[PDB]
Amino acid sequence: SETLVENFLSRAALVSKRSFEYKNHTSSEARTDKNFYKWTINTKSFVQLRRKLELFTYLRFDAEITILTTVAVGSNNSTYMGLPDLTLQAMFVPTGALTPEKQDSFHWQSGSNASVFFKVSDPPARMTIPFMCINSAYSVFYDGFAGFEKNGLYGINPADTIGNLCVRIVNEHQPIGFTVTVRVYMKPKHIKAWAPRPPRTLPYMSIANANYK
Amino acid sequence: NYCCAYGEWPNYLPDATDRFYTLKSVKWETESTGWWWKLPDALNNIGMFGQNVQHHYLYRSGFLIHVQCNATKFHQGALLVVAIPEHQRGAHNTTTSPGFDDIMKGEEGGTFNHPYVLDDGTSLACATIFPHQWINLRTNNSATIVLPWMNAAPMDFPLRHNQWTLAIIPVVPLGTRTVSSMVPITVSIAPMCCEFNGLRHAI
Amino acid sequence: NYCCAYGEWPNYLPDATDRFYTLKSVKWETESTGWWWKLPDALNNIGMFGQNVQHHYLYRSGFLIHVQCNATKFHQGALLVVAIPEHQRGAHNTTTSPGFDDIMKGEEGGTFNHPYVLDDGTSLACATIFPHQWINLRTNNSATIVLPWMNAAPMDFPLRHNQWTLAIIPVVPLGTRTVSSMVPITVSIAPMCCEFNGLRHAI
Amino acid sequence: NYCCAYGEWPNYLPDATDRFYTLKSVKWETESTGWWWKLPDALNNIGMFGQNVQHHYLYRSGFLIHVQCNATKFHQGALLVVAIPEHQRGAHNTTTSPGFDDIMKGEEGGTFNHPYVLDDGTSLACATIFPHQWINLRTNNSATIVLPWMNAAPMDFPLRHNQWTLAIIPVVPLGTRTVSSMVPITVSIAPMCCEFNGLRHAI
Amino acid sequence: NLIVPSESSNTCSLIGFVAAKDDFSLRLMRDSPDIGQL
Amino acid sequence: NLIVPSESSNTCSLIGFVAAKDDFSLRLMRDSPDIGQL
């Protein structure tokens, strides 16, 4: 029973820990986070849960998402001052839907998209991402190309891109900067696993492909 | 005896091209690393099924893999015939995704670069979890493998997706003390329970 | 399995000498053309049947042909064993009828001059219309052929007529890469359902 | 198939150690005379049965002899596997009784000095009166022999008596034309229906 | 490819055959050009 | 001893396998040291 695949794959492993900075990034920033981070939901960024999910080909599951956000003071301020409250509008962007580019990026209203509301002074955000892919399971691999052009990337599904889990500061900027470490936890429930693969032996170098060295 | 994948017979989709498309048989040597044929890319350009690949935007097909190792009884060697479900390959020591010519090898199929890790970061030592038989020339001269529909999508494009991937690997190299002699790997694939919809232009 | 001629078992005439008369086995080589034994001329001089040939003016007999090719499994070669019904031979490039010594070869039998045309103007390529088996050393090491009475006359003289004619022909020459080695053709003939009348002097 | 001695299955005494004790397999050569293993002296020092030999003053046991000659099919040779009941050996040209080291050979067993007379004054040509099989590599690669209790005493000491004596003799020497190559004689003995009484010190 | 042992014959061979099924039929019997008088 | 014909391959080989019976069980799932991020 403990060795059931539902019991096996439902471990809340950290797959994206983004310590994204909360400051007036509109003042002088070039490429970095503008009080928001756009993370495409792929379960392959951290190799523990990745090698847990390279065990199988096809993995249809209801992907429970748990977002634990901890606000720490910035090193520029170098003062504690107490932890201020900060509600976060955590949007999931589905495949095909547009992704935001700013903190006030006009997509955060989410007329079609689904966003949740929570605070930092509240236990972590537990919702359940629906199994949304066009195919009947999550092909974590793709022996093929996403597009019909030759330069399409190998290994990427045009259907298993889960979305973009975009988390911002809906509140305005503070004069005191704060590094918000957002930790993303995947609890895949309702595991429907198919066709087991060997566990990976050689270390990874690229998240997208399965190259070896 | 056949070794149908995970104990189920292939069939049509729930609510002509069954000719055994024998490939050009590869020379098995002592130094032969192994040969992989991605399906239907091994049959994308040959036969009426190969024309159905271009003529249809979507497809579904099972495959009756039959590998033949015609050998003397004095010959030595076992090949892992493994039909990998969805073999996403990798390249050694590079972070780059492998391109068209390293995967879309056509009817001839690709050789194995580092087959011990199965050229994908896994281990071939565990690759007997797969649809798999043995062509150990002591007892088995010809093996066969039955492959159902293996895709999360019910019915998809052939020309930009490989569902199965045959991989014939010499886990034990050839032995006849004339280094190697004859022994071809006659890989014959019959697309069984084939179905094609989406009548469009021949891509 | 036996291959009785045209699917009928031999029998006595409608209204002792059944010993397997094994011949001196011929060396099969790569350059061996083929060997024919005319019946009962191959058994005219050997055994109690051979004495019955001389002691009787008329005779009838079936023959249970058994050819043995004891070989290694690494040996190569198939011989057409054909029992020709009434093999009138011919000689190459001559209009003369072939004489006694070219036909009455005795127990040893005659070699084949040009066996591709079966030394009679026909073709051996069609000579599988005959009572015929294969001694392909891949699977078949020993063949046998059952021969009934084959003569338009019901019962005739042995010493001036050959009814059947065994012909063991290498359609594929021998292969063991030591050009050729051992492999005898043990041709054993048992006159079965033999019958002899006309008790006269031993001719 | 087994060849149980004189057609009777072994059993317990009328009113644990059944592991197949495989020996160190002897090299069979062309010049190999033959090898004899006296029982239980071949198993006196190996295994839990070997410890039961020392730990018990008296014993009874049957033996399931299994000889394995793993060979190529191109290899040649038949060994007489004979389990002699009570093989009192002899030495050539001497009147002296053979001593400890010529008989108590241990697990490795003794070679044959003059095996044609079976090293006891008899003839090996008649030694097929024995429990006996053939390991003729043409057809038989592995033989086995079932041995009941063979002693006039119902139950006696192991360490000073050999009831059976295996003797694997090349009546025909090995042939592979590379004089000899590989072919071990895997002699595996399982003491079946073993029984031990007389719990004394380990002798 | 043909694979043979290093002790066996390297040049292997193969023999074809033809026969008919029971559905074979012939009409319009004619003199063949296989043979002729001269 | 391994005995091979003088025409066949002298260096023979052998392949092992492992699997479980139906009585295999596992508890206390942990992160393996087979792989790690760096």
Side-chain angles (χ1 to χ4, degrees):
Chain A
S1 40
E2 181 97 321
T3 178
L4 285 170
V5 69
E6 161 56 5
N7 273 253
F8 178 74
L9 272 206
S10 156
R11 196 159 211 260
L14 187 34
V15 309
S16 40
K17 173 185 128 28
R18 180 58 99 239
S19 65
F20 83 103
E21 181 53 48
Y22 163 59
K23 170 53 50 156
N24 201 275
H25 281 248
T26 68
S27 171
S28 291
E29 292 283 84
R31 190 273 344 154
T32 80
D33 75 301
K34 330 273 295 299
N35 287 1
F36 91 105
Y37 82 111
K38 173 247 204 197
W39 172 68
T40 293
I41 305 105
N42 79 92
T43 44
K44 275 78 49 188
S45 297
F46 273 71
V47 311
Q48 293 46 19
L49 183 129
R50 190 194 187 152
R51 199 191 104 119
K52 226 159 185 314
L53 277 100
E54 280 107 0
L55 253 294
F56 328 106
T57 69
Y58 298 134
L59 266 178
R60 163 201 275 275
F61 48 80
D62 223 11
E64 192 294 349
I65 178 50
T66 288
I67 308 102
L68 163 64
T69 82
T70 313
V71 173
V73 302
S75 60
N76 44 355
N77 321 280
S78 85
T79 51
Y80 273 163
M81 172 145 168
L83 296 181
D85 87 312
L86 219 47
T87 88
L88 306 198
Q89 212 50 46
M91 150 144 46
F92 161 105
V93 168
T95 302
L98 207 43
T99 72
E101 254 83 7
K102 306 263 300 159
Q103 49 148 101
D104 248 1
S105 159
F106 172 75
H107 307 78
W108 296 101
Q109 287 76 358
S110 80
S112 316
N113 314 287
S115 70
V116 298
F117 28 67
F118 71 104
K119 312 205 42 143
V120 289
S121 60
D122 165 342
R126 304 131 302 188
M127 49 311 298
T128 297
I129 288 292
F131 172 71
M132 51 65 77
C133 158
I134 305 302
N135 317 345
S136 173
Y138 293 152
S139 322
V140 284
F141 319 91
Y142 215 126
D143 193 7
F145 303 89
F148 322 108
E149 82 261 41
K150 204 260 286 188
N151 61 81
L153 282 184
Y154 181 72
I156 329 304
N157 196 346
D160 271 333
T161 300
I162 306 310
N164 296 269
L165 179 73
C166 204
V167 152
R168 66 143 170 177
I169 312 300
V170 50
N171 327 91
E172 273 85 358
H173 63 136
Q174 198 63 35
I176 290 298
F178 287 104
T179 301
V180 185
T181 306
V182 166
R183 320 174 92 81
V184 157
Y185 279 150
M186 321 305 258
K187 274 211 311 163
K189 328 171 301 198
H190 308 120
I191 307 313
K192 314 297 170 49
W194 285 289
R197 229 81 71 61
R200 160 110 183 189
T201 57
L202 294 203
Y204 307 87
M205 46 307 289
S206 156
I207 314 294
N209 52 65
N211 292 7
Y212 65 102
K213 154 195 55 54
Chain B
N1 195 9
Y2 26 75
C3 163
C4 44
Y6 320 109
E8 158 284 349
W9 210 241
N11 37 55
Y12 284 170
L13 60 94
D15 82 330
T17 64
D18 318 329
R19 162 160 136 175
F20 257 86
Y21 284 1
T22 174
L23 302 190
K24 299 319 280 179
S25 323
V26 279
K27 178 38 173 160
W28 183 16
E29 301 255 350
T30 65
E31 51 275 60
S32 290
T33 85
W35 323 264
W36 47 270
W37 291 273
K38 291 175 165 332
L39 299 201
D41 175 282
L43 303 70
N44 260 8
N45 307 329
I46 174 165
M48 183 57 267
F49 173 82
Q51 293 323 329
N52 273 289
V53 155
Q54 332 276 3
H55 273 90
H56 290 85
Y57 179 49
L58 317 83
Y59 103 101
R60 85 172 273 149
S61 273
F63 301 98
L64 205 139
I65 289 330
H66 189 280
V67 308
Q68 153 185 120
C69 215
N70 52 275
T72 64
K73 314 308 307 167
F74 320 102
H75 270 102
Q76 186 209 19
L79 305 143
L80 258 291
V81 54
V82 283
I84 313 129
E86 169 48 52
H87 191 213
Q88 173 153 331
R89 299 181 37 87
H92 199 28
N93 302 329
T94 76
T95 82
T96 324
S97 285
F100 221 62
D101 251 12
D102 290 342
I103 284 134
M104 281 315 78
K105 284 283 205 325
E107 159 280 358
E108 52 268 75
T111 58
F112 262 105
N113 323 121
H114 300 87
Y116 177 61
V117 301
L118 254 200
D119 279 326
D120 67 337
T122 69
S123 74
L124 163 153
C126 329
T128 43
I129 192 45
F130 284 175
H132 65 332
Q133 282 267 33
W134 272 262
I135 316 106
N136 170 227
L137 303 165
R138 179 155 178 89
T139 80
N140 193 307
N141 87 299
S142 91
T144 206
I145 280 284
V146 152
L147 296 178
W149 182 229
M150 201 36 49
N151 189 20
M155 192 205 158
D156 71 329
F157 28 80
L159 78 90
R160 277 303 197 279
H161 193 182
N162 320 124
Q163 330 334 325
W164 291 105
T165 294
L166 281 193
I168 321 314
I169 309 105
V171 283
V172 163
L174 201 143
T176 175
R177 44 161 90 171
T178 87
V179 67
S180 161
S181 288
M182 174 182 239
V183 154
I185 317 300
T186 309
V187 183
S188 66
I189 306 105
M192 61 97 88
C193 72
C194 54
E195 212 36 79
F196 293 87
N197 276 45
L199 211 35
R200 328 273 282 279
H201 40 255
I203 312 124
Chain C
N1 195 9
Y2 26 75
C3 163
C4 44
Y6 320 109
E8 158 284 349
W9 210 241
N11 37 55
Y12 284 170
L13 60 94
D15 82 330
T17 64
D18 318 329
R19 162 160 136 175
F20 257 86
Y21 284 1
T22 174
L23 302 190
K24 299 319 280 179
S25 323
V26 279
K27 178 38 173 160
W28 183 16
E29 301 255 350
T30 65
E31 51 275 60
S32 290
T33 85
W35 323 264
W36 47 270
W37 291 273
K38 291 175 165 332
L39 299 201
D41 175 282
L43 303 70
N44 260 8
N45 307 329
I46 174 165
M48 183 57 267
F49 173 82
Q51 293 323 329
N52 273 289
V53 155
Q54 332 276 3
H55 273 90
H56 290 85
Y57 179 49
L58 317 83
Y59 103 101
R60 85 172 273 149
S61 273
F63 301 98
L64 205 139
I65 289 330
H66 189 280
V67 308
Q68 153 185 120
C69 215
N70 52 275
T72 64
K73 314 308 307 167
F74 320 102
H75 270 102
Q76 186 209 19
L79 305 143
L80 258 291
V81 54
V82 283
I84 313 129
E86 169 48 52
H87 191 213
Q88 173 153 331
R89 299 181 37 87
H92 199 28
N93 302 329
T94 76
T95 82
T96 324
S97 285
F100 221 62
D101 251 12
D102 290 342
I103 284 134
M104 281 315 78
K105 284 283 205 325
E107 159 280 358
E108 52 268 75
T111 58
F112 262 105
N113 323 121
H114 300 87
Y116 177 61
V117 301
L118 254 200
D119 279 326
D120 67 337
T122 69
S123 74
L124 163 153
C126 329
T128 43
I129 192 45
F130 284 175
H132 65 332
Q133 282 267 33
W134 272 262
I135 316 106
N136 170 227
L137 303 165
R138 179 155 178 89
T139 80
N140 193 307
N141 87 299
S142 91
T144 206
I145 280 284
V146 152
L147 296 178
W149 182 229
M150 201 36 49
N151 189 20
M155 192 205 158
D156 71 329
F157 28 80
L159 78 90
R160 277 303 197 279
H161 193 182
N162 320 124
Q163 330 334 325
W164 291 105
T165 294
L166 281 193
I168 321 314
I169 309 105
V171 283
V172 163
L174 201 143
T176 175
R177 44 161 90 171
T178 87
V179 67
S180 161
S181 288
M182 174 182 239
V183 154
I185 317 300
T186 309
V187 183
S188 66
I189 306 105
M192 61 97 88
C193 72
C194 54
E195 212 36 79
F196 293 87
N197 276 45
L199 211 35
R200 328 273 282 279
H201 40 255
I203 312 124
Chain D
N1 195 9
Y2 26 75
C3 163
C4 44
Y6 320 109
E8 158 284 349
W9 210 241
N11 37 55
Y12 284 170
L13 60 94
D15 82 330
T17 64
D18 318 329
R19 162 160 136 175
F20 257 86
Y21 284 1
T22 174
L23 302 190
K24 299 319 280 179
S25 323
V26 279
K27 178 38 173 160
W28 183 16
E29 301 255 350
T30 65
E31 51 275 60
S32 290
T33 85
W35 323 264
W36 47 270
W37 291 273
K38 291 175 165 332
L39 299 201
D41 175 282
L43 303 70
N44 260 8
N45 307 329
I46 174 165
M48 183 57 267
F49 173 82
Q51 293 323 329
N52 273 289
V53 155
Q54 332 276 3
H55 273 90
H56 290 85
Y57 179 49
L58 317 83
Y59 103 101
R60 85 172 273 149
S61 273
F63 301 98
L64 205 139
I65 289 330
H66 189 280
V67 308
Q68 153 185 120
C69 215
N70 52 275
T72 64
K73 314 308 307 167
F74 320 102
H75 270 102
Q76 186 209 19
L79 305 143
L80 258 291
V81 54
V82 283
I84 313 129
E86 169 48 52
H87 191 213
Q88 173 153 331
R89 299 181 37 87
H92 199 28
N93 302 329
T94 76
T95 82
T96 324
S97 285
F100 221 62
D101 251 12
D102 290 342
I103 284 134
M104 281 315 78
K105 284 283 205 325
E107 159 280 358
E108 52 268 75
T111 58
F112 262 105
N113 323 121
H114 300 87
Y116 177 61
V117 301
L118 254 200
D119 279 326
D120 67 337
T122 69
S123 74
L124 163 153
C126 329
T128 43
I129 192 45
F130 284 175
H132 65 332
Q133 282 267 33
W134 272 262
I135 316 106
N136 170 227
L137 303 165
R138 179 155 178 89
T139 80
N140 193 307
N141 87 299
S142 91
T144 206
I145 280 284
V146 152
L147 296 178
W149 182 229
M150 201 36 49
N151 189 20
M155 192 205 158
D156 71 329
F157 28 80
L159 78 90
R160 277 303 197 279
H161 193 182
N162 320 124
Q163 330 334 325
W164 291 105
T165 294
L166 281 193
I168 321 314
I169 309 105
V171 283
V172 163
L174 201 143
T176 175
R177 44 161 90 171
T178 87
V179 67
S180 161
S181 288
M182 174 182 239
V183 154
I185 317 300
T186 309
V187 183
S188 66
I189 306 105
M192 61 97 88
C193 72
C194 54
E195 212 36 79
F196 293 87
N197 276 45
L199 211 35
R200 328 273 282 279
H201 40 255
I203 312 124
Chain E
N1 183 41
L2 167 81
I3 287 162
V4 289
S6 47
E7 159 277 350
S8 162
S9 38
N10 47 3
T11 80
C12 260
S13 304
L14 152 61
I15 288 294
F17 298 96
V18 277
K21 306 317 286 198
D22 325 312
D23 81 359
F24 211 91
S25 74
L26 294 146
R27 275 183 342 121
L28 203 62
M29 153 178 59
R30 88 179 149 90
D31 318 277
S32 78
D34 290 301
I35 217 63
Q37 87 276 4
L38 61 85
Chain F
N1 183 41
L2 167 81
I3 287 162
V4 289
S6 47
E7 159 277 350
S8 162
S9 38
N10 47 3
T11 80
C12 260
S13 304
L14 152 61
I15 288 294
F17 298 96
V18 277
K21 306 317 286 198
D22 325 312
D23 81 359
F24 211 91
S25 74
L26 294 146
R27 275 183 342 121
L28 203 62
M29 153 178 59
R30 88 179 149 90
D31 318 277
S32 78
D34 290 301
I35 217 63
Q37 87 276 4
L38 61 85

